[PDB]
Amino acid sequence: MKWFNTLSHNRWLEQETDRIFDFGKNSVVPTGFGWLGNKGQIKEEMGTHLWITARMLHVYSVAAAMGRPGAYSLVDHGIKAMNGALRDKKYGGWYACVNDEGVVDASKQGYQHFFALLGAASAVTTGHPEARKLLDYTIEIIEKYFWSEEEQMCLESWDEAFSKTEEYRGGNANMHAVEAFLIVYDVTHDKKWLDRAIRVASVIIHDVARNNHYRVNEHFDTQWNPLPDYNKDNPAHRFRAFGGTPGHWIEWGRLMLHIHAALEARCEQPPAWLLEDAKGLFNATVRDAWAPDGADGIVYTVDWEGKPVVRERVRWPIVEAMGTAYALYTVTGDRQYETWYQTWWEYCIKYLMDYENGSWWQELDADNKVTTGKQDIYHLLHCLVIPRIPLAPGMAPAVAAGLLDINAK
Amino acid sequence: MKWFNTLSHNRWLEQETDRIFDFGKNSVVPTGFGWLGNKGQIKEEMGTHLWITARMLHVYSVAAAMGRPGAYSLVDHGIKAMNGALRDKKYGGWYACVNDEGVVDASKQGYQHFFALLGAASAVTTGHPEARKLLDYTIEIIEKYFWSEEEQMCLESWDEAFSKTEEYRGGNANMHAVEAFLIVYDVTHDKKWLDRAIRVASVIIHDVARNNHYRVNEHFDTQWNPLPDYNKDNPAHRFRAFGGTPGHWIEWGRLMLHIHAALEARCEQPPAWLLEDAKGLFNATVRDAWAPDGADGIVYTVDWEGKPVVRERVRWPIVEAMGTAYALYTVTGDRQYETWYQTWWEYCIKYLMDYENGSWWQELDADNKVTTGKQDIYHLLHCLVIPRIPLAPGMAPAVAAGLLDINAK
Amino acid sequence: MKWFNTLSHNRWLEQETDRIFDFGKNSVVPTGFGWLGNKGQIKEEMGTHLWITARMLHVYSVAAAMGRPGAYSLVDHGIKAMNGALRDKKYGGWYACVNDEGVVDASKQGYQHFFALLGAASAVTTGHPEARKLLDYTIEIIEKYFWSEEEQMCLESWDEAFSKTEEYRGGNANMHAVEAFLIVYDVTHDKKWLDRAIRVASVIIHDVARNNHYRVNEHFDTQWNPLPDYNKDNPAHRFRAFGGTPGHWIEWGRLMLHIHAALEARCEQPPAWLLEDAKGLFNATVRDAWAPDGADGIVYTVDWEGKPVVRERVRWPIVEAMGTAYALYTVTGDRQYETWYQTWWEYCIKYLMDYENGSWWQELDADNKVTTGKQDIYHLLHCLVIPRIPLAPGMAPAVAAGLLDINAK
Amino acid sequence: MKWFNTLSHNRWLEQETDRIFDFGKNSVVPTGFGWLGNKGQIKEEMGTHLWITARMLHVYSVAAAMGRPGAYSLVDHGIKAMNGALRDKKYGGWYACVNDEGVVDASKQGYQHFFALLGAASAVTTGHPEARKLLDYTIEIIEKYFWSEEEQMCLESWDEAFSKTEEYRGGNANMHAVEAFLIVYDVTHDKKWLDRAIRVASVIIHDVARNNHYRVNEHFDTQWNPLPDYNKDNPAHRFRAFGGTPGHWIEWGRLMLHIHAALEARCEQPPAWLLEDAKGLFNATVRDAWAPDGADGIVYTVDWEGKPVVRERVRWPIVEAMGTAYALYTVTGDRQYETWYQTWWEYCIKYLMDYENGSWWQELDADNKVTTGKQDIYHLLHCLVIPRIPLAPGMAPAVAAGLLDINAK
Amino acid sequence: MKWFNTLSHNRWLEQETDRIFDFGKNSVVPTGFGWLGNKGQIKEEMGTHLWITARMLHVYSVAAAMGRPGAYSLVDHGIKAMNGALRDKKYGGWYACVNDEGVVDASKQGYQHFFALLGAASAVTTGHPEARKLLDYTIEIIEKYFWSEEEQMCLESWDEAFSKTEEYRGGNANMHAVEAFLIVYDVTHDKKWLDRAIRVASVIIHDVARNNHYRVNEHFDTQWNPLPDYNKDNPAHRFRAFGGTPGHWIEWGRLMLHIHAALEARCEQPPAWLLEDAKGLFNATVRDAWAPDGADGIVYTVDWEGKPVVRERVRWPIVEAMGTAYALYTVTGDRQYETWYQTWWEYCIKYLMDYENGSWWQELDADNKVTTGKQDIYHLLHCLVIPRIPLAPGMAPAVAAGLLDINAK
C-alpha cells in the first residue's frame, strides 16, 4: 500500500485533524487553556498549565493557517494569555500553573518555557500584530535564564525569583528547545537558532545516545555527565523515569531530520550524522519498544539492556513514531518506513482513537486496554499534518507558506 | 495569514456549503419553497413566497453544478413551481405569495420578479429541458412591466392586473435586476443585459451614491429624484427603512466588479469608475457600519451623517461584505481585503453560525446576542462559493463551466 | 498514436509556429505588408494588398498574445496601415491594393474587407489603444456596404466610390465574413454577429451545399440563385474557378464548429445541423479531393461529379483540412479525425515544408513536385495554433485568454 | 545540483532529441536505413544492415509517439523494409545485410533478429496497421530459431538456410533479446517474455558476472561454459573482443531494473537480486572503466583484473552509463547516481557532441581526441528519453501511453 | 495583453536564455573568462578581468541549475580561476586584471570583489565541492577590506598591497554589495548579510536618493558627503560620469524588492519604504530617462534637473528596467508595470538583439543605431530569468530550488 503523498490518505488525515481541532476548542479558559478530560470537558482542579497553553497557541496557529474560522481567535486568546496572569511580570517568564484564583505553581520550568518559545514562533506565522512582540520577549527570557551561555545547552528549571537554577540537566527540556529553535529559525532566518539546535543534538544524541545503542540518556548532572541510574530505586515512577523512553528517541530523530532539511534548504550539505542518528534512533525504538512483551504497541520505558520497564502504551510515543517514519521515508525513500507508518496507523485506529467520546485515548494497558484525561492534541499534528508537508521549513511556517499537499497526487 | 485561493480553506467553505444545502432541503412544499424556522422546520403560516422560491431555484442550480445528487430534483421542483400556482396565468408574472388555499398576496413586485429572472438564468446552466423556456418567459414579463423603456431603469411594483405601477423607485429592486442581468448575460451573450446592468449602476451608484460619501440613497420619486428623508419620522421601521443600508452598499460593490470582470473577459477595458466605486462603497461600509457602537458587527442602517440608526446585526450584510472583500481582493490584490474577510469569518463562526439548530442565525441585537426564522441560504453562497471562483462569468455559470477552485492551490 | 492534446506534439507545433512568425516579419513595408517570395524576400511588384495586410495584423495579434516580442509592434504597424495609405479618405473602406506611389487597385473587395474586420477584431485582443477604434470604424463600413440588410448575406464588391455593387454573390466572401464575425462576436458579445454567422452558413451550407452532395456551390447571381456552370468554359481559370474547391468545404466545416462551441460556451444547445454538416463537408472533402488521381494530396477543384479539375496541390486546402480534423475530433472524439490529421501532417512535412528557403511551399503539381511565391502564413495558424486551444472562444481571444495548451497533458 | 525530473533539464533533452531525430532522417534508402557517416551522409558501401534498419524502426516509433511529423512515415518505411528485401522469402528470418544489387550478408544473426523483435514491438505502439502482423511473424522466427527451448537461453546465429547454428553463445545477443523481450511483453502481456528475460539475466548476470567481480563474461561455448580467454591472442582485434566491455555491464544493469519495475507494475515484489546486481554492475563499470588511464572517459575493453585493454572511448558505453545512472536513481533515490549522470553529461557535451557536423562522434582515442561514421542514434534515446519516463512500461510503450515528463516539475 | 506568468512567454525567454548561455561559452581562457567581441570572439588584448570572471561564474551557476550540460564545467573553471592567477597569493583578494603573462592591473576594486562574493555565493547553489570554500574565503576578504565596520557601508578600492583605501565612496560598489549580500544571505541565513543590505540601501536610497527626486547620487567623499558636482566639468566622461545613472536607479529598486521578499519569506513585515522607494526610483527612471530626446530608449546619464547628459543608449540600463518592472508587478499587481515591460521588450528586439552576430549589442547612439564589444551576459539574466521566478530567494538559489515557472500557467 502507498499512503504517503496520496491525496486520498491526506484527505483522511485532514478530516481527522479537524475532529482534533474541534476537541481542543473547549479548553478555552480566562487565563489560557484548560486541561480536558476523557469527554472533552474541562477539569477545573488541573488549572492553567503553561505547557498546555503554549501548546494550544501552537496548535491553533497551524489551524489558522489551514483556513479554519475561529482558529485565529484562539491564537489571539493564547497570545493574550501569554501576556496575562501566566506571565510573572515581576521576575519574568511564566508561572508553571495558575487558575482564576491565582498562581498554582510558581516555578519556572525550562521545557515549559521552550514550549512558550514554540507557541510564540508558530503564532508569528499567522501575522497576528502581537505575535512578533511575544516571540521577542520570549527570546529575551530564554537567552537570559534557559540557554546557558557557558554550557551552550539548556538549563532545567528555576525558583520563581530566578535565584537558583536546579542542579540537573534533562534531555526533554533540551529536545523541546531544539523543537522551538527550528521554528524560531524559520521566522527569523537567524542561523544562531539552528546552530544551537544542532549543538544540543550533537551533545545529547550524537555523543551519548549514539554510544548507547541509540538509547537516549535523559538524566545528567551539572557537568553534563550522564546519570544512568537516576531513579533506579523507583523505576516505576513516571516523573524523570528510570532509563530511556523510546518515545523521545524517535522524536529526537524527526527533529534532526528537520535540521537536516533546513541546511539543504539553504544549499548547505548537512553533516551525515543527522540522518545516521535519526536512522539509529528509529531502529533502537523498533528494536526495544515495539511489541516486545507479547502484544503490539510501543512501551513507555526500557532499561539499559533494552528490556521494558514501564509497559503501559502511552499515546504520544506511537504518534511521534509515525511522524518520524514519515520523516525518514521523505529523506530516504526507503519504503520500509511507510510500512511501519501504516502498521502503526492500524494500531492507532484499533486501540487509541476514540470516536465515541472524542479525540484519542491517553494511556493503555500492556494488553492495550484503556486504563482508569486527554489534555493534549499537540502531538497529533505530528502524525496528522507533518506527513502532508515538507521537512523544511517547520510545520506552522510550512502550512502558512501554503505547502500543504505540495508533494501529493 | 493566507486563506484565499488555498485548497485547505476552500475545502472548509465547501463543507460548510453542504451543511447549508442540507438545511434548505426542507423548504420544499407543493407550491414551491417554504419559509424555514430556527430549527429548519417549515413555518407554514408564512406560505410560499415568490422571492424565496426564486432564490432556492438559484441555490440548487449551483448545488447541481457541484455534483450533489438531489439538487437537480429541487431545481426541477423549482421550475415546475414557477410554472404552477405561483404564476398568474391571467395577467402574467408571479404572485408575491401563495399557499394551499390560494393566493396570499397578489401584488407584482419588481425585486421578486428579478429574483425570478436570476433563478431562471441559473436554472439554465443545469441544462434542465424547461429552464430556457422559463427564462424566455421571465424576460417577456420583465421587458414588459419591470424594465422601463423611457426610464431605462427598473420599476418597483404593480397591482395584480398590471393596471397601475407604484409611484416609487427603489435601489434594491434595481440592484437585483443588476444581479439577475449579469447571469442572463452569461447565458445569452447578448450585451443588452450587461448594458442595462452597468446603466442602472451608473445612475444609482456612479451618479448618486458616489457624491454622497458612497452612502447609497435607496428611495427615489418617479422622476428618479432622491428622497433622502423617506421614512425619516420612523427610522426604526424595517420596510423601506430611513437612511442607508451598508449591507446593500457592499452588495453593489461586488456586482459592479462582476460587470468589470465581464468587460475584461471579452477584451474590453472596463470603465475605471466600476472599481473606484466598488472601493468607495466597501470603504464607506467599514467606515460607518463596522463596530461603530462599542461592539463588533455590521449595523443595519445609518443616517446621512453615517450615524447608526438600526443597530441590530442582520446576518446577510456581513455575509455580503465577505463576498465583496473577496471580489476587491481578486481585482486589486490588496491583502487588506483578505484581512477584513478573515476578521469577518472570525466574527461569523463566533456569533452567527448555528451548528446546533442548523444553518446560521438571522439577526442579533447590538451586543451580538441572538434575538427571536432562517428562511434564506441564498446570501450564504456569496461568502461560501464566490470566493472559490473567478468574478466572470457569474456564479452558476462559473461553477457549471467547472471553474470551482480554478485559482486555488 | 496520440498527438492531440499532448504537450510533446504541441511543443513541436509552437516551435514551427515561431519559424512561421519569423518568416513573415520580413513583409513589413511602409504602407503595410508586402508579398513575400519563395525565399521570404519582398516582391515589390505585387505592392501592398489589403487582404495580405489585414491577415498579418491578425497573425501577429496571435503571436503577440503568445508573448513574442516584436509581434505587438507589427500589430501596431498593421493598425497604422489600416489608417494610412490603404484607407480611402474620400469614400471610406480600403483600396484593394496600393504602393509607395499610389492606388494600384481602387476597387472595394468584399472578402478583403472581412479580412479587415477579422484583423481589427484580433488586434483588439492585444489591447492596443487604437484597435477598438479601428474595429468600430470597420463595423460601420461593413454594415454600410458589405452586410446586406435586405439579403441577410454578404455582398461581393463595389467600385471605388461605392456607387455600384457587383451583380454577383460568392461563397468565399461570405465564409470569411463568418470567420470575422465569430471573433467580432467574441470581443463585443453583440448577439447579432453570431446570428449573422449562423444565417450565412445556413444558406450556403445547410441549404445549398447539403443538397449538393456537400460540395459547396461557390457562385451565385444577385438573387442567390446558384450558377453551377460559372466559368465552365475555362475550367482551368482559377479566379472564380469552375466547380467546387474542397479546401473551402473543409474550412466551412471548422467555422460551423466554432459557432457550435460559441453556443455551448453560453449554455445553449446548438442546432444539430452544425455538427451534421461539418461532418458532411469533411467526408465530401476526403471523398472527392484526397488522393483521387494516383498520388497523395488534396486537389484544388472538382466538378459536380466529384471528378478533379484543377489537380495542383495548393497549400492552404490541406492545412485547413488538418484544422477541421482537429475541430471534428474535439467535438466528436472520433479518433479517425486524428488519424487524418496525422495522415496530412506526414504529407506536409514531406512535400510542403521548406526548411531550406523558409516557410512552406505554396503549390505543387499533381505529382506533388514543387513549382512556381509564399505571400501567406495566416492559413498556417489553423493547423499550428488551433489544435492547442478549445473551439470557443475564437483563436486570438482564446490565446489572449491564456487557454494555450489548456487541454494538453 | 538537481536535474532529474526537472522540466528545465528535460526540455534540454527533448531539444537535443529532436536534433538527433533529424540527423537520422537522411539514412533512408529503398531497402531500409543506410549507414550514415561523420557528416550525416549515407556511406553506400556499407549497404543496408538488419540491425540498423530495425533500430531506426524502433527509434522513429518513439519520435512518432512524441508527435513529430515524418516519424510515422519512417516507421512505415521500416515495416515495409522488414517485409521486403531484408526478408528471406525462402528460409524465413532476415539477411544480415542487403543493398540494391542483392544479399550482401545472408547469415542469420541472433542479436540482429532480436533488434528486429524490438523494432517490431516498438512499431506496435504507433498503432501502424501492419505492425502487429510483423511482430507475430518475428515471434515465430524467434521461438523457432533463436530462443532455445532446451537451453532456455538465446542462440547466436545460423547459416542462411537455418541448417547449422553456430557452436558459440554470447552475452550481447542474449542481452538484446532481454531488451526486446521487455517491450514484446509490454504489448502482449504474455508473461513468458518477462520470464525469459529474467531467466537470461539470472544466468549471464546472477550466476556468472556476479561471481566474476560483476564483470560480465561475454563468450561461452555450446554448453554455456565461459570462455574467458576467447580471442586473448587477438586483444584489440575487434568483433568479439577479449575480456569484458563495461558498456555492456552497465546496459545489463538498466535492463534488469526495467524487469524490476515491470514486476512492481503488476503488484508483484521483485527478486532482491535484480537491484543488487544492477548496483554491482554499475560499481564495477566506474571502478574499472571510468577515468582509469590518466584521462576521463569509459574505456571500451578491460581484462579480468579490471585493467584496461582497448582504451579508446566509444560513444555508446558512456551514453548507456547515463541511462543506467537514471535507472538506479529512480529506484534507489541515491543522489550519487545523479552526480554521475551529471559528470557524464559534462564529459559528453565536451568531447562527444558534434554540433558542427551533426549528432555525436562515434569513437575517441585514449586522449579523448576525435578519430575516424555515425551509423547509430538508437543508443542516444537511452540518455535523452529514458530519463523523462518511468521504468515501466518500456520506452516506446511509455511515450505512447503519454508518460513523458509525468514525474517532472 | 499579458505575458508575465504565461508559459508561452517564459518558453520564449528560456530559448533566448540558451542563446545567451551559448554566446558566453567562448569567453573561456586559461586564467578565467575573457572579453567577448561583437562576434563572440575573444578580444585577447582586454585580458582577463575579475568582474567578468566573477559574473560568468555566477551566470553558469544559474545555467547549471537549469540542467544545461557544460555549465557546471564552466562553474568549475570559474572557481579554479578564483583560486588561480586572479588571486593575489601575497596580499590576498583578487587583482582587477591579469593575462597569461602576469598581472595587468594589481589594484583591488570594491565592486569587483563584491561580484566575486556574488559569483562565489551563486556557485554554492550548484553544490560544487569547492564552492563553499571560495565563499568563506571571499567573506573574509570582504569583512576585512571592503565592508567598513566603522562606516557600516562599503569601501571603494585599495592599492595592490591593501595599505591605503581610496578617499572616495560610490553607489555602484555598495549596490553590487547589496546584490551579493542577498545571495550570500540565501545560502547561509546569517541575518547580518540582509541587515547590511538594508543598511546600505537606507543610506544611499532612503536618505539620499529619496530626498533628491529619487535620482541616485553616485559620488561621495570619505565621510559619505554627497559630491553632486563630481566630474561636472566633463559630464560626458564615462568613468564616474557626472549626474545620475537611471539604469542604476532602477536596479536599486529591484534589489530593494528582493529584500522585501526575503523579509516576507520569513514571516516578517518589511519596512514600508522598501516598496515606496522602489516605486519612486522606477517613476524617476521613466520620468527622466525614457524617450526624452526625440527617440525611444533609456539614456545613460541625466543631470540634477532630470535633463539628459550622456544620451547614448547602453544595453544594461533598459535590461534592468524590464527586470524591475517585473519585480514591481509581482509585488504590486499593477498591470502598468507589465505594459512597460512589454514596451521595453519591443524596443530590445528591434534595436538591441543581434541574431546576426550573436547576443545583444552593447551600445547605440541617440538614434538607436549601433556604435563602437559584447563582454557581458550577466545583466541579461535579469530580464530573461528573473521574471520566471519569485523574488525570494535570490535567482541562483530560486532556480536551484526548482522554482522556475512556479507561478506560470
Annotate C78-113 with DSSP letters as a single string: HHHHTTTTTB-TTT-SB-SEE-SSSEEE--EEHHHH
Q: How far is CA B148 from CA B113, B153, D82, in A?
A: 14, 6, 79
Q: Which residue has the cell 532612503?
A: E206
| DSSP element (H, E) containing A116 | helix A110-124
Q: Among C346, C350, C356, which would you mutate to test the D interface (most chain D Cβ atoms within 10 Å of its Cβ)? A: C346
D15 annotated ligand-binding residue? no
C97-98/C48-49 β-pairing: antiparallel
Distance from CA of D391 to the nearest CA of A (A): 17
**Given C132, C186, C190, which is nearest B191 (Cβ)?**
C190
Quick one: which of C15, C28, A331 has its CA closest to D18? Answer: C15
Give chain C's end-to-end CA distance (angstroms, integer). 15
Q: Which residue has the cell 544551537?
A: A196
Report the alpha-carbon distance of residue B179 to residue B188 in Å, rounded: 15
B267 contact residues in C (CB cutoff 8 A): 124-125, 127, 186-187, 397, 400
Using the beta-carbon criterion (under 8 Å), do D67 and C12 form an inter-chain contact?
yes
Q: In 10 A of CB D269, how many CB atoms? A: 7
Contacts of B18 (CB under 8 A, 6+ apart): B68
Q: In 10 A of CB A42, how many CB atoms? A: 17
Report the alpha-carbon distance of residue D172 to residue D152 in Å, rounded: 16
Q: How many CB pairs under 8 A join B and C?
A: 48
Report the alpha-carbon distance of residue B286 to residue B324 in Å, rounded: 12
| DSSP element (H, E) containing A63 | helix A50-65
Q: Are D381 and D62 in contact, with CB atoms under 8 Å apart?
A: yes
Report the alpha-carbon distance of residue A401 to residue B1 in Å, rounded: 9
Q: CB of B188 within 8 Å of any CB in chain C?
A: yes
Assign C404 to helix, strand or coil: coil
Q: In 10 A of CB D237, how many CB atoms? A: 11
Quick one: cell of A303? 532499561
B185 annotated ligand-binding residue? no
φ, ψ dihedrals at A271, nearest 5°: -60, 140
Chain A 388-407, residues with CB within 8 Å of chain E CB atoms? 397, 400
Q: CB of A270 within 8 Å of any CB in chain D?
A: no
Mutual orientation of helices C246-265 and C315-332 as an angle, nearest 10°?
30
Method used to solve the structure: X-ray
Contacts of D332 (CB under 8 A, 6+ apart): A333, D275, D279
Question: A238's torsion region: left (phi>0), alpha (psi -120 to 50) or beta?
Answer: alpha
Q: Are A310 and A241 in contact, with CB atoms under 8 Å apart?
A: yes
Report the alpha-carbon distance of residue D194 to residue D262 in Å, rounded: 8
Q: Are D296 and D368 in contact, with CB atoms under 8 Å apart?
A: yes
Helix then strand then coil, % of chain D, to nearest 5: 50, 10, 40
Q: CB of B349 within 8 Å of any CB in chain A?
A: yes
Report the alpha-carbon distance of residue C135 to residue C114 in Å, rounded: 11
Report the alpha-carbon distance of residue C48 to residue C51 in Å, rounded: 9
D408 contact residues in A (CB cutoff 8 A): none
**Residue C90, Cβ density class (10 Å: 0-12 exposed, 13-18 middle, ≥19 buried):** exposed
Quick one: which of C391, C322, C375, C290 has its CA closest to C42? Answer: C375
Q: Are A60 and A124 in contact, with CB atoms under 8 Å apart?
A: no
Maximum Cα–Cα distance across chain D = 57
DSSP 8-state secondary structure symbol assigned to residue E146:
I
Chains adjacent to E (≥3 CB pairs closer than 8 angstroms) = A, B, C, D
Domain segments of chain C: what residues?
1-409
Quick one: which of D89, D88, D86 has its CA closest to D97? Answer: D86
What are the DSSP E strand ranges found in E247-349? Answer: 313-314
Assign E85 to helix, strand or coil: coil
**Cα radius of gyration (chain C):** 20
Which neighbouring-strand residues pair with C109? C157
Contacts of D56 (CB under 8 A, 6+ apart): D24, D27, D32, D33, D74, D78, D119, D377, D378
Which neighbouring-strand residues pair with B105? B97
Question: Chain D: residue nearest C350 by CA?
Answer: D70
Contacts of D101 (CB under 8 A, 6+ apart): none
Report the alpha-carbon distance of residue D289 to residue D250 in Å, rounded: 11
**With breaks defined as C to next N over 2.5 Å, after which residues does chain A break?**
372
Q: Are D288 and D302 in contact, with CB atoms under 8 Å apart?
A: yes
Quick one: cell of A198? 544542532
Report the alpha-carbon distance of residue D186 to residue A353 in Å, rounded: 45
Quick one: which of A185, A348, A366 has its CA closest to A262? Answer: A185
Quick one: which of D139, D145, D128 has its CA closest to D193? Answer: D139
Catalytic residues of D: 248, 379
Q: Are A55 and A125 in contact, with CB atoms under 8 Å apart?
A: no
Question: Chain B: residue nearest C264 by CA?
Answer: B187
Q: Are B182 and B194 in contact, with CB atoms under 8 Å apart?
A: yes
Q: How many helices (H) and strands (E) does chain B have?
A: 13, 13
CA E371 to chain centre: 23
φ, ψ dihedrals at D28, nearest 5°: -65, 130
Quick one: cell of C8? 510533446
Residue type at position E75: V
Binding positions of A for 6-sulfo-beta-D-quinovose are 55, 111, 172, 176, 238, 251, 362, 375, 379
Report the alpha-carbon distance of residue E311 to residue B292 in Å, rounded: 58
Quick one: which of D134, D126, D118 has its CA closest to D81? Answer: D134
Distance from CA of D312 to the nearest CA of E (A): 22
Catalytic residues of A: 248, 379
Q: Which residue has the cell 541574431?
A: E355
Q: Is C58 labeled as catalytic in the residue annotation?
A: no
Contacts of A66 (CB under 8 A, 6+ apart): A14, A17, A399, A404, B8, B9, B12
A404 contact residues in B (CB cutoff 8 A): 6-8
Assign B165 to helix, strand or coil: strand
**Residue B46, Cβ density class (10 Å: 0-12 exposed, 13-18 middle, ≥19 buried):** middle
D32-33/D48-49 β-pairing: unpaired
Give the DSSP per-residue string, D235-303: SS--SS-SSB-HHHHHHHHHHHHHHHHHHHTTT-PPPHHHHHHHHHHHHHIIIIIBS-SSS-SB-S-B-
Q: Which residue has the cell 522469402?
A: D89
Which neighbouring-strand residues pair with D226? D220
Report the alpha-carbon distance of residue E287 to residue E307 in Å, rounded: 10
| DSSP element (H, E) containing A147 | strand A147-148
Q: Which residue has the cell 523510546?
A: A246
Q: Are A176 and A248 in contact, with CB atoms under 8 Å apart?
A: no
Residue type at position A212: N
Residue type at position D76: D
Q: Are E303 and E292 in contact, with CB atoms under 8 Å apart?
A: no
D122 contact residues in C (CB cutoff 8 A): none
Give the DSSP per-residue string, B279-309: HHHHHHHHHHHBS-SSS-SB-S-B-TTS-BS
Contacts of D148 (CB under 8 A, 6+ apart): D154, D155
Report the alpha-carbon distance of residue C324 to residue C249 in Å, rounded: 10
Catalytic residue among B248, B258, B260, B382: B248
CA D75 to chain centre: 18
Q: Are C287 and C321 in contact, with CB atoms under 8 Å apart?
A: no
Q: Are C105 and C96 in contact, with CB atoms under 8 Å apart?
A: yes
D219-220/D169-170 β-pairing: antiparallel
Report the alpha-carbon distance of residue C174 to residue A25 in Å, rounded: 70
Report the alpha-carbon distance of residue A63 to residue A183 in Å, rounded: 16
Give the DSSP per-residue string, C323-382: HHHHHHHHHH--HHHHHHHHHHHHHHHHHTB-TTTSSB-SEE-TT--B-------TTTHH
User: B198-207 in b/e burial notation, b at 16+ Cβ within 10 A?
Assistant: bbbbbbbbbe
Mutual orientation of helices C246-265 and C273-289 as an angle, nearest 10°?
160
Report the alpha-carbon distance of residue D122 to residue D57 in Å, rounded: 8
Q: How far is CA E307 from CA A164, E231, E293, E311, in A?
A: 71, 16, 9, 10
Assign E98 to helix, strand or coil: strand
φ, ψ dihedrals at B88, nearest 5°: -90, 90
Q: Are A331 and A325 in contact, with CB atoms under 8 Å apart?
A: no
Q: Are B326 and B341 in contact, with CB atoms under 8 Å apart?
A: yes
Report the alpha-carbon distance of residue E324 to residue E249 in Å, rounded: 10
Q: What is the CATH number of domain E1-409?
A: 1.50.10.10
Q: How many CB pairs under 8 A join A and E?
A: 49
DSSP 8-state secondary structure symbol assigned to residue E94:
B
Q: How far is CA C26 from CA B209, C23, C261, C265, C374, in A?
A: 55, 6, 35, 38, 12
| DSSP element (H, E) containing B62 | helix B50-65
Kindly compute the dihedral angle of the four CA atoms of residues E152, E153, E154, E156, in this order, to the nearest 10 degrees. Answer: -120
What are the DSSP E strand ranges found in E265-316? Answer: 313-314
Q: CB of B187 within 8 Å of any CB in chain C?
A: yes
Residue type at position D252: W
Quick one: cell of A327? 520523516
D41 annotated ligand-binding residue? no
Residue type at position C306: G
Contacts of C205 (CB under 8 A, 6+ apart): C216, C252, C256, C277, C281
Contacts of C362 (CB under 8 A, 6+ apart): C314, C315, C373, C374, C375, C376
| DSSP element (H, E) containing C73 | helix C71-81
Q: In 10 A of CB C222, how many CB atoms? A: 13
Q: CB of A294 within 8 Å of any CB in chain B?
A: no
Q: How far is CA C295 from CA C212, C236, C243, C290, C354, in A?
A: 26, 20, 21, 9, 20
Q: CB of C335 within 8 Å of any CB in chain D?
A: no
Residue type at position C188: T
Quick one: which of C186, C197, C190, C252 has its CA closest to C403? Answer: C186
Quick one: cell of E104? 595587468
Q: Are E92 and E81 in contact, with CB atoms under 8 Å apart?
A: no
Question: Chain C: residue nearest D22 by CA?
Answer: C355
Mutual orientation of helices D335-351 and E71-82 as an angle, nearest 10°?
90
Which neighbouring-strand residues pair with C42? C36
Exposure on the CB side of residue A374, measured as CA atoms within 13 A: 22
Assign D74 to helix, strand or coil: helix
Q: Among D2, D10, D14, which would you mutate to test the E interface (most chain E Cβ atoms within 10 Å of its Cβ)? A: D2
Report the alpha-carbon distance of residue B366 to residue C393 in Å, rounded: 51
Q: Are B51 and B387 in contact, with CB atoms under 8 Å apart?
A: no
Q: Which residue has the cell 451565385?
A: C220
